[PDB]
Design a protein around this nucleic acid. Structure first.
Lengths: 108, 113, 46, 119, 49, 83, 297, 67
RNA sequence: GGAGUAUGGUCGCAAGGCUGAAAAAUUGACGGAAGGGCACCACCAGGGGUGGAGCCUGCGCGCGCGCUACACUGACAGAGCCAGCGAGUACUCCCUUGGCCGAGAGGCCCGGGUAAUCUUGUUAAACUCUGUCGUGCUGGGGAUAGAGCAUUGCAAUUAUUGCUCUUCAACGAGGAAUCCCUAGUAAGCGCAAGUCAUCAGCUUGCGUUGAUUACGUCCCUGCCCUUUGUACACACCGCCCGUCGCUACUACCGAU
């Protein structure tokens, strides 16, 4: 049980460190750090597998009405060197009319 | 009393034969305007009908899955063709020798011979 | 050859150990539970 | 059901009925007659209609917009344009419903994807 | 030993043996990382002995 | 020729597979070897028991083709390791 | 066409999930039918379910048909089992060697209806595309190490399973001389399978025996002169290819005509060769504790 | 392996899939296409055949002859 | 207490040797002749390997996969200048632009990137052009070898790899054979990954450039099949052949 064990039965076992001749390579990854690494990789691969399923089973004739108010991801040919697959969003700025810029420049 | 799906002249040119979605095909004579025989073995709408070069045999495909083959000197379908998996043929052609029938449907993309 | 021999020996040894101790624990539990139920029956009649 | 269970015509017409309903897309399985007991349903027919099946295929966004688009006549099923919003799309014509030829909706999709070929 | 080049799974491991004879003796052996990653000695490497 | 066809032809030559002879044909056979040839047939038509090259010899010298038995050699080596 | 392949694969996966739930119910319904015929008393949780009885009255007959074996299970092979001759193409890896191309020819000649294709510069999704575009039943890919083959990939189409296996002890047809070998007979081969007993073994038996065209069942027990043998020990299926004459009613002379393998499968995926992200059905569990003790197939 | 092959060939049992007829369902007897109480149960079977003719016509006409 | 499901014991049957290792058939056994179909394991037209020298996995000085060449559709030197699949650094030193220094390899100072955002338009190689060389083992080829400078690494000797000078071998299209190949196929070229089996002495992807010659015929070599069936009109064909078995009947022969 738990009362049938001495304090030397309860005593913790220490963890060894990376050798000092090899400490420049980083920390010695043990089971806990390996579990963190494996959890992050399995999570990222699960998201990527779901994205690959969604890109495979895509209707080529789909029509949402946000397509008339968004700029598409395009291709590398149409966009150019600045091509990421992400749809570009708006930063909030807008082209500003001349009367309001006349007001702002009088204030400045 | 349905939509006339297809028609072909006879190679003589005296009579034409039309195939409608009523299930019947019938052979009209050009002079006198009367149908002279109504073949009624199809149990669904009849698509394309075709002749050979010889003009004595008529091959008719339909949506009940059968390309039938009638002989117009005896008025009986000497052949009926089906695909092993069940299709519904919507178009067909026949060699002018009269020995090979090809037919194609909308359910499978293969073309049967 | 040493791989195949050691894997055969490990399978046979683990199977023999599992069989022997299943027999031993079953016989011990059987005899002890039989005597315990007989004593509970002879105690409940008093 | 009321036929005896080892009957040949019962078994043949069970397979025929289940295959017909699964080919029309009403049932989602073809291995139970309780599907025709409590799964065949006027809502199953009405969701095999055309604006709901193109809502599911994401040709439109909502069934209201889909009925508007197939009343304006952008949607063909196969090779023929469909103006009736009650055309029951079967399971093998859900692979052939698409936009019409000179469609402004098709130009909108191609202009979004930046593949607007004007030829 | 110590890893030398690390690919996705196959890693080359350097400071453990001295010759391909010793590696050919210890072929197929259960090698292990400190972290807990198991592995198997697959093949001796030619150019660094 | 095929291996099937040459096997059938060699067994017809050895008389193991031919037509059902009458009693008169068996009288002729008892009026007028085959295991020694059947050993060669069962060795020749199962050529994967032994290792052979396909090219033949590189330089022909004339002076007066099974080059090794891997199955028998592996079994012999495993018996040596058992001992 | 591609939308139809995707739609039919999705319908197949949904029907398989519904079959899982319906099997969980139909294990309870088979106790009610056996208790009705034999009169042994059944569980109250089974006998007091009104939905189960009300639906049991309609769904007797498929359980009786499955008991008699009159119907076949929902499978990717049961649609076209003995109706169509399965066409199958054998291909190499990208830049094959001469012994890999001769081995590809040899295992093409193993199947009487197969064809061989030169890879060259052929991207693997377009290979899958051309297979579905020409309605092939099976593709088989080959991988060599250095003039000796080390892997097969048997993929069933339109959406069927892959079996990837590694080859060992390959003795080629192209090593023995033409005086001893000859042109292999192309008759429809008999098949024998020895040692497959698990449902996974019947799975690999199905995806291996639906590569061959169906034999005419009128007099197949005595006619036909060519046999192909798949026999497994320690889940490494070993395959021979013999040709035989029946030299008597009690004896038979065999003659080894084809290549010898002992292929070991390491991956059976419910999805074709292009899908690297398909859900696996079985894979060779190395680096586990008792994965070497446990024998599958 | 060779003796297993010889046993199967002699007492011939082969695991090849056999060529089945494509119309085993509708034509189970396999007739040739050329020159050629229980009454309650028969009446019930004929009623189901009549019902299925009507219902199959309605369902094919509602799917608009794609079937 | 009833009903199931298991687990391990106990008992009974199985568990008594005219013995001593290596058929079925009215449906069967084997062929022949004629006529078809198919095949880069066939013909025909071409192409390409391997086989010559060296290295080495594998299989049982010998062997196999390879790389590089024998040049003029070329080598060299300028100059033009064009991809695609990839990858990349946290409790860290990964992918690296630009600025100097250096002939080079490299060094050094900074810098962008956990990334469609930075490397990277990966300005890749064959390739294209304007030159030099001129058929000579020649400037084709670059093995072997000396001396030197660098990088990785705790370590480089048995030379990890990189650069410079020099040394400049065999190899003049591979022989007999043997094998493979019919369109984005043969062949050239690089870039990336390393996926529970196999694979670094390599494997598998990915792009780029992209031909000649067949695409007919069963004449050779073969393989499969018809001569029974499986549908009916037109139309055509018109009892394929041998050696035996088995069964039924008939009479014969000679011992008991």
């Amino acid at each position: 049980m738990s009362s049938l064990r001495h304090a030397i039965q309860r005593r913790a076992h220490k963890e060894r460190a990376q050798p000092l001749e090899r400490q420049r390579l980083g920390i010695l990854e043990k089971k806990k750090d390996y579990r963190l690494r494996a959890r992050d990789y399995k999570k990222k691969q699960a998201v990527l597998k779901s994205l690959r399923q969604k890109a495979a089973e895509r209707n080529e004739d789909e029509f949402y009405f946000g397509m008339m108010s968004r700029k598409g991801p395009g291709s590398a040919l149409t966009r150019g060197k600045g091509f990421t697959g992400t749809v570009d969003g708006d930063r909030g700025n807008k082209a500003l009319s001349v009367e309001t810029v006349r007001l702002l420049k009088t204030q400045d | 009393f349905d939509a006339m799906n297809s028609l072909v002249y006879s190679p003589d040119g005296q009579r034409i034969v039309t195939a409608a979605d009523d299930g019947k095909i019938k052979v009209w004579d050009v002079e006198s305007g009367f149908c002279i025989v109504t073949f009624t073995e199809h149990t669904s709408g009849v698509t394309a009908c075709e002749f050979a070069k010889k003009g004595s045999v008529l091959f008719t495909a339909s949506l009940d899955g059968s390309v039938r083959a009638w002989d117009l000197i005896r008025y009986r379908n000497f052949r009926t063709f089906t695909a092993p998996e069940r299709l519904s043929f919507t178009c067909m052609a026949v060699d002018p020798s009269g020995e090979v029938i090809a037919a194609g449907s909308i359910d499978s993309f293969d073309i049967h011979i | 050859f040493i791989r195949r021999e050691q894997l055969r020996i490990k399978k046979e040894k683990d199977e023999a150990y599992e069989k022997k101790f299943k027999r031993i624990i079953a016989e011990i539990q059987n005899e002890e539970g039989r005597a315990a139920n007989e004593y509970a029956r002879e105690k409940a009649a008093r | 059901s009321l036929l005896p269970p080892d009957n040949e015509v019962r078994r043949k017409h069970e397979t025929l009925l289940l295959d017909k309903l699964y080919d029309m897309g009403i049932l989602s399985t073809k291995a139970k007659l309780s599907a025709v007991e409590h799964n065949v349903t006027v809502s199953a027919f009405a969701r095999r209609r055309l604006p709901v099946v193109m809502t599911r295929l994401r040709m439109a966004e909502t069934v209201q917009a889909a009925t508007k688009l197939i009343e304006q006549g952008h949607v063909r099923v196969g090779v023929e344009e469909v103006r009736d919003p009650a055309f029951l799309v079967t399971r093998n014509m859900e692979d052939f419903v698409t936009w019409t030829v000179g469609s402004k909706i098709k130009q909108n999709i191609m202009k979004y994807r930046d593949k607007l070929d004007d030829f | 030993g110590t890893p030398w080049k690390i690919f996705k799974n196959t890693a080359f491991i350097k400071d453990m043996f001295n010759s391909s004879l010793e590696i050919a003796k210890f072929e197929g052996a259960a090698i292990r990382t400190v972290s807990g990653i198991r592995g198997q000695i697959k093949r001796a490497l030619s150019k660094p002995e | 020729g095929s291996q099937l066809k040459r096997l059938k032809a060699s067994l017809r030559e050895q008389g193991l597979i031919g037509p059902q002879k009458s009693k008169k044909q068996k009288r002729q056979n008892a009026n007028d070897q085959k295991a020694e040839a059947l050993k060669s047939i069962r060795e020749q038509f199962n050529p994967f028991q032994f290792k052979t090259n396909a090219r033949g010899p590189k330089f022909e010298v004339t002076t007066n083709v099974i080059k090794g038995r891997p199955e028998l050699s592996r079994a012999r080596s495993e018996e040596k390791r058992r001992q | 066409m591609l939308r139809k392949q995707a739609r039919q694969r999705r319908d197949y996966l949904y029907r398989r999930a519904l079959l899982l739930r319906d099997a969980e119910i139909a294990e309870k319904r088979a106790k009610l039918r056996a208790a009705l015929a034999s009169g042994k008393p059944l569980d109250p949780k089974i006998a007091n379910d009104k939905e189960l009885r009300k639906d049991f009255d309609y769904d007797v007959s498929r359980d009786i048909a499955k008991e008699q074996g009159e119907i076949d299970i929902d499978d990717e092979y049961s649609e076209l089992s003995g109706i169509v001759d399965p066409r199958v193409l054998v291909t190499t890896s990208r830049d094959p060697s001469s012994r890999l191309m001769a081995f590809s020819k040899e295992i093409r000649l193993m199947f009487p209806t197969a064809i061989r294709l030169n890879r060259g510069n052929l991207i693997l999704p377009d290979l899958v595309m051309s297979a579905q575009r020409e309605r092939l039943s099976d593709i088989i890919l080959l991988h060599e190490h250095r003039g000796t083959p080390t892997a097969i990939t048997i993929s069933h189409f339109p959406h069927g399973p892959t079996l990837m296996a590694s080859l060992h002890n390959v003795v080629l047809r192209a090593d023995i001389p033409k005086s001893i070998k000859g042109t292999v007979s192309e008759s429809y081969p008999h098949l024998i399978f020895e040692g497959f007993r698990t449902p996974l073994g019947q799975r690999v038996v199905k995806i291996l025996k639906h590569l061959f065209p169906p034999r005419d069942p009128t007099n197949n027990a005595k006619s036909g002169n060519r046999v192909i043998t798949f026999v497994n020990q320690d889940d490494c299926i070993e395959v021979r290819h013999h040709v035989y004459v029946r030299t008597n009613y009690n004896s038979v002379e065999l003659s080894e005509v084809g290549p010898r393998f002992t292929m070991r499968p390491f991956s059976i995926t419910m999805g074709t060769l292009e899908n690297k992200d398909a859900d696996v059905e079985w894979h060779l569990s190395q680096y586990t504790r008792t994965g070497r003790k446990k024998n599958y197939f | 392996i060779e003796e297993l092959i010889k046993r199967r060939i002699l007492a011939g049992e082969f695991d090849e899939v056999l060529r089945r007829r494509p119309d085993m369902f509708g034509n189970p007897h396999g007739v040739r296409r050329g020159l050629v109480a229980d009454e309650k149960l028969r009446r019930d079977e004929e009623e189901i055949k009549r019902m299925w003719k009507e219902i199959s016509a309605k369902l094919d006409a509602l799917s608009s002859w794609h079937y």
